[PDB]
Amino acid sequence: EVFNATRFASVYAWNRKRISNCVADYSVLYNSASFSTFKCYGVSPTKLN
Amino acid sequence: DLCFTNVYADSFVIRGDEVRQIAPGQTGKIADYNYKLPDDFTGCVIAW
After folding, report:
1. How far, in Å, are A1, A8, A9, A15, B19 from residue A12 at the CA level?
2. Distance of CA B35 to the CA centre of its chain
3. Which segments carry the region annotation Integrin-binding motif (chain B)?
4. CB within 8 Å: B29 and A30
């Protein structure tokens, strides 16, 4: 619903979506999603799991 | 101005978007399942 959305919002009207009651298993994005930028600030990436 | 003790060159080919994953503390497909750098890595990463 987030990374595979058909339409994205404009930057001036950026969309905010709540995420709750789910497992953050981002490895499912490994197959189809390629990211040019991935920068975490308050947390090391290797600890996200 | 330096001399290097145990020089090893690790060569491979990845995507353009995955070059950022070649770093000591990165996550992702390449960093997790293909090639991981140590946290105390001493050396240089070159990509073209």
Report:
1. 21, 12, 8, 9, 31
2. 7
3. 15-17
4. yes
